[PDB]
Amino acid sequence: SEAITHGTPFQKAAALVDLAEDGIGLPVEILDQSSFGESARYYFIFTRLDLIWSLNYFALLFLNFFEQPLWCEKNPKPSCKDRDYYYLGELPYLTNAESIIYEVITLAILLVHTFFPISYEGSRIFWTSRLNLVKVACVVILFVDVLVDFLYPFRIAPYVRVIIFILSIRELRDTLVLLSGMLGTYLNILALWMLFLLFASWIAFVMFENTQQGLTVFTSYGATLYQMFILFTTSNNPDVWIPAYKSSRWSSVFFVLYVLIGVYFVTNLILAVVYDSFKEQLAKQVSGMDQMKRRMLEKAFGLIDSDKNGEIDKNQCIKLFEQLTNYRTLPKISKEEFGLIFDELDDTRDFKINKDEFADLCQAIALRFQKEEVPSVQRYRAFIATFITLIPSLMPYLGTIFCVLCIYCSIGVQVFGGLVNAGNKKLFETELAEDDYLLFNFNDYPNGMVTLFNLLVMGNWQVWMESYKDLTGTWWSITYFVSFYVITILLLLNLVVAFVLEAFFTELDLEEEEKCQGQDSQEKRNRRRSAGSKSR
Amino acid sequence: SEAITHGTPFQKAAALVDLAEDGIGLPVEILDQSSFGESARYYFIFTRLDLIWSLNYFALLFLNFFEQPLWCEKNPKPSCKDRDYYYLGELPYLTNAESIIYEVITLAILLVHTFFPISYEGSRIFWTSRLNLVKVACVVILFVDVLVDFLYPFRIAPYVRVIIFILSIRELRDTLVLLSGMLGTYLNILALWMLFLLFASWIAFVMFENTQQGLTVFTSYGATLYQMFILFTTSNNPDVWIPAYKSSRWSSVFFVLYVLIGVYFVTNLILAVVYDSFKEQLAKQVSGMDQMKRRMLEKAFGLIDSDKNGEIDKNQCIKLFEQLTNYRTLPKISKEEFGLIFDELDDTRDFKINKDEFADLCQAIALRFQKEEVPSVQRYRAFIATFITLIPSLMPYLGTIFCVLCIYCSIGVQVFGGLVNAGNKKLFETELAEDDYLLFNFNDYPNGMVTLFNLLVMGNWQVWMESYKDLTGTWWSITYFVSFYVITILLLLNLVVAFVLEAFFTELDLEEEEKCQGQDSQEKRNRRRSAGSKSR
């Protein structure tokens, strides 16, 4: 009945479906847990105990990562008029008595989660893992800031509480691999983007240095790199160039052509690269998954074959479909599937004897049958097939961005803290006061979390920018809001706009071939997929 | 020497390069000019005379289509304070004496251009063409409005001066074919977009009706379909939902999730369809060009064969390779290209040619040699290979949109004419006055031409919209500015964003393959293009 616990039995025909199930649904057994001579030791007994308790672990992660909004501003301590909310937010701030209660519970599960794969890896393997020295070093930094906050800089706990949450889920770590391979392409297209703003902030400063434009908005060259940056974003379109329009009507020809080249030529070609870098980096992940599948099926192959000659006979395959617990009657399948597998050796009268034959067989049952069952509108179809596929497909690629904003909030709370006050006199002339944003704030953590969202939508995103270049007084605040743009024109065009285009072309292709596959043959022909995945 | 015209010689050897050149560089011979028994008749003498005078014709089209900005408002005649510019623009308005001078010169050349292919088509063919009746009916409407304006509604000349200009250039007419085939896909994705604003203007009206949101912005349901439409555009992001955030901070979760689903899920999937509809409609145009190329090469085949058995002789191929004027060493090519063409009949040793064999041979010399002589940074390359390709590739697809704006100006001048005055008292409370746009205006034609551009960039595009819902006093002005969105966030996601993605993937497969186009073989194989275009 219950096929959950299996490492302690694991017969020669039963420890197949330990490996043959995990090759289908694609989980991971660790490579140290895979390379054993026995492959059913107390390592593997303790390993599936990690996957049992997994719902405790993610519930710790969102405990640790939703900690930060409930917790105090960096500076209420120098602040005058502390408790009275000057545009703060309605969430409570957990007190110092409430501090050690919430972090020690959080570390009591993180210390279990980090030092658990010692129970199935060697200490020369665990400590030489390099995605796991990172995860241990993140714990010790939290263990400092627990005990420092107990026994009483800028307190780098809330940055580490993100990076633990990034590395601990596989999806957000699998995503972040792509953003390292894409980064060597994106920085070149960033470098030919900055050249576009610089060469066209020069002509916009050459042309208008005499007139009523350069008297008013385009004074210094550093305030035409800055303005023409915001025109590239479109979000300041007619306001930049009214007094160059009002003076000579012909100066729209500069500005209606720069935004035309800027937004409709370059911005699609930053999208084109970051989509074309995605297609190569996604292929490097999927082939990084099939070698994980082939390195599972090769374990399943040699587990059955006793002499390890390199082959398995037909009768030695017939016993597997019953071990699969898949279909009712056995002998009508394996000889039927032999022709269905694209190449049969026919060196013996019955068997096809290779390793690569089985590694395609166990996946060939997967696409067709789905008969395991572990007991424990045509007009609108291609749109809502994708649109419902994309609620869990963009949970990593919109989870990375929610982690990028949990960093910029935590930077942006600290750099830009209790400045929007009720009584800051620079504020009441800014664009925050006149547009009455005066909230969307940065004065706390969740005030900042929303504000980065409006900066992410680009809905009037320069109101916040040009206020904090006047509240902080420096032009160095500009680099907070330019780096949000740059990093999230990868992340909003990689991870989303390139993904939702490819996600449509799957649920197009599954509609364009479902008319073809059901009419081409009664059974599935495998190489049409070999020409179909490389088709577009 | 001079071999420009040569329809009057047109030998068995001279009229071949009449057909063999036009099959390469792809001009058009009309199908009535193609189906003749002689194919060099008194009709064909005049056909190449049409292509000689072609620079007169484009220069007339731009005369006819850049007429409109230089010409008067629809209503200066009821207007008080006529000559004094109340926010008008600096272009002159050509007078009634200047009327008949500029239009009769313009109509002197339409009547040439329209009734010229009578000189190479029958009058039962010219008048049964369904395009060439549209282009005649457009002339007669201009001939009315010339003679009406001479001998002294809304004067539908400026709409026809666009549609003549659309049909007369081939690329703007070739483009507009696609926008009819895409239209049956776009109206469904319009219809499921329209449902998204309706179902989410309902929940935003169910939820916020009691509170300080529905007291202030969300009063009627027609003013939440309207507001949540502008949130879909993002361009009104925090202003809509301040007093539903100021009241409860928890009600950003509605509005930061609706824009997230709106702009990052739907808007990419309207892009995905309109890109996917482009790929099919562009393929239907390119195969509409090869059957035009095959229907030229079959004329070249039938010109050579006097027997018309179905085959041409090899010695006849070689002496017409010489008439091609291609290369200096002739006889080492034809048997060399026999292997280089993917198939050879090989029925006799020399002379066994199919019509499909020659149909690639004339293409075989084209893709490789490029020798005719009509005498008359690795890091950044794939970006600027596209970015320089796209100055003439997006001239049709940004010429259609410049024609869509030349209609909406001409509509939008007439509906919205003299409203923004110096002394309209509704104006000086509107968003046009406070943001001081107040030009961007619609009071003339080129004031309107710019204003549709800012509406096209979406830079604060609702300032104009909510002004004309208060200047015209009705909510029917909204439909002017919602149709500009709907029709041209097709045309800016079809014709640009989908095109610039495909234009990258060509000029990136001419680099990914170009290392293989020099290392795999020194002489080009044709069937890698069968595996290069179908697979990428």
Ligand SMILES: CCCCCCCCCCCCCCCCCC(=O)OC[C@H](COP(=O)(O)O)OC(=O)CCCCCCCCCCCCCCCCC
């Ligand atoms: C604010 C809270 C939002 C709640 C989002 C719900 C996320 C559900 C997570 C439940 C399982 C997570 C395990 C973590 C990753 C490794 C395992 C895996 O491969 O997942 C397979 C899993 C499906 O397989 P199964 O759950 O094992 O059946 O796919 C997923 O749905 C989760 C993928 C990533 C999970 C974390 C990333 C999102 C967190 C950031 C919050 C984003 C807020 C932005 C709002 C957008 C809404 C439109």
Ligand SMILES: CCCCCCCCCCCCCCCCCC(=O)OC[C@H](COP(=O)(O)O)OC(=O)CCCCCCCCCCCCCCCCC
């Ligand atoms: C307001 C002033 C705008 C002036 C812009 C000038 C644009 C130059 C286009 C002149 C060429 C007209 C071709 C005649 C009809 C097409 C036939 C053909 O096969 O063309 C081959 C031609 C190349 O072959 P070739 O010239 O024969 O060597 O392709 C083209 O270059 C033009 C294709 C589109 C046809 C005209 C559409 C443009 C007019 C709308 C103006 C757009 C303003 C928006 C600003 C965008 C700038 C970034």
Ligand SMILES: CCCCCCCCCCCCCCCC(=O)O
């Ligand atoms: C790409 C993702 C963007 C994510 C933007 C994050 C949205 C966070 C907003 C949550 C605000 C919660 C305020 C709590 C108010 C209360 O209950 O008292």
Ligand SMILES: CCCCCCCCCCCCCCCC(=O)O
């Ligand atoms: C393609 C790049 C060309 C444009 C590079 C030009 C930038 C150099 C600086 C221009 C003049 C600086 C204006 C005043 C600066 C100052 O001395 O304070």
Ligand SMILES: CCCCCCCCCCCCCCCC(=O)O
């Ligand atoms: C990526 C290109 C631009 C990115 C960010 C734009 C920054 C340009 C703004 C420079 C500030 C103006 C220089 C200060 C002038 C002064 O000291 O008076």
Ligand SMILES: CCCCCCCCCCCCCCCC(=O)O
């Ligand atoms: C991280 C590097 C990206 C580039 C950042 C800015 C590029 C050059 C810096 C702009 C400052 C130029 C201002 C000099 C002119 C002036 O202020 O008068």
Ligand SMILES: CCCCCCCCCCCCCCCC(=O)O
């Ligand atoms: C992923 C870990 C963090 C990555 C970048 C975070 C740290 C960059 C800036 C954080 C502190 C900078 C603030 C300095 C100015 C100040 O404190 O007044």
Ligand SMILES: CCCCCCCCCCCCCCCC(=O)O
């Ligand atoms: C997840 C990566 C994010 C890290 C990049 C953000 C850091 C860039 C600037 C942070 C603030 C620096 C400017 C502060 C100006 C000031 O001191 O007032």
Ligand SMILES: CCCCCCCCCCCCCCCC(=O)O
């Ligand atoms: C990735 C970030 C891009 C960099 C954006 C530039 C931010 C730096 C500011 C530019 C000019 C400021 C120099 C003047 C200094 C001052 O006035 O205090």
Ligand SMILES: CCCCCCCCCCCCCCCC(=O)O
């Ligand atoms: C997608 C294309 C958008 C096109 C927008 C059209 C720009 C037209 C603006 C031209 C204004 C001409 C006024 C000149 C005044 C004068 O020279 O006297």
Ligand SMILES: CCCCCCCCCCCCCCCC(=O)O
């Ligand atoms: C998926 C579609 C569901 C939403 C459709 C609801 C639209 C019906 C109109 C709602 C009530 C109108 C509100 C007052 C208008 C009036 O009577 O004047």
Ligand SMILES: CCCCCCCCCCCCCCCC(=O)O
């Ligand atoms: C594409 C979806 C909507 C398209 C344009 C939005 C139109 C909704 C606005 C309706 C106006 C309000 C109805 C009038 C109310 C009244 O008479 O008091």
Ligand SMILES: CCCCCCCCCCCCCCCC(=O)O
């Ligand atoms: C061309 C059709 C597209 C749809 C246009 C609008 C869709 C329904 C019309 C909106 C008006 C609904 C207003 C009812 C509520 C009210 O007036 O108070």
Ligand SMILES: CCCCCCCCCCCCCCCC(=O)O
């Ligand atoms: C392609 C030819 C034109 C297509 C659509 C153009 C005509 C639609 C509207 C034109 C006039 C409508 C104005 C009516 C209101 C009024 O005149 O007061």
Ligand SMILES: CCCCCCCCCCCCCCCC(=O)O
């Ligand atoms: C190129 C196609 C464009 C045709 C579509 C535009 C016509 C839709 C509305 C035009 C104005 C209609 C609303 C006018 C309101 C009023 O009378 O004040």
Ligand SMILES: CCCCCCCCCCCCCCCC(=O)O
């Ligand atoms: C394709 C165009 C989309 C249509 C957008 C709707 C345009 C008008 C819809 C709302 C009009 C409100 C009806 C009340 C009329 C009035 O108050 O005068």
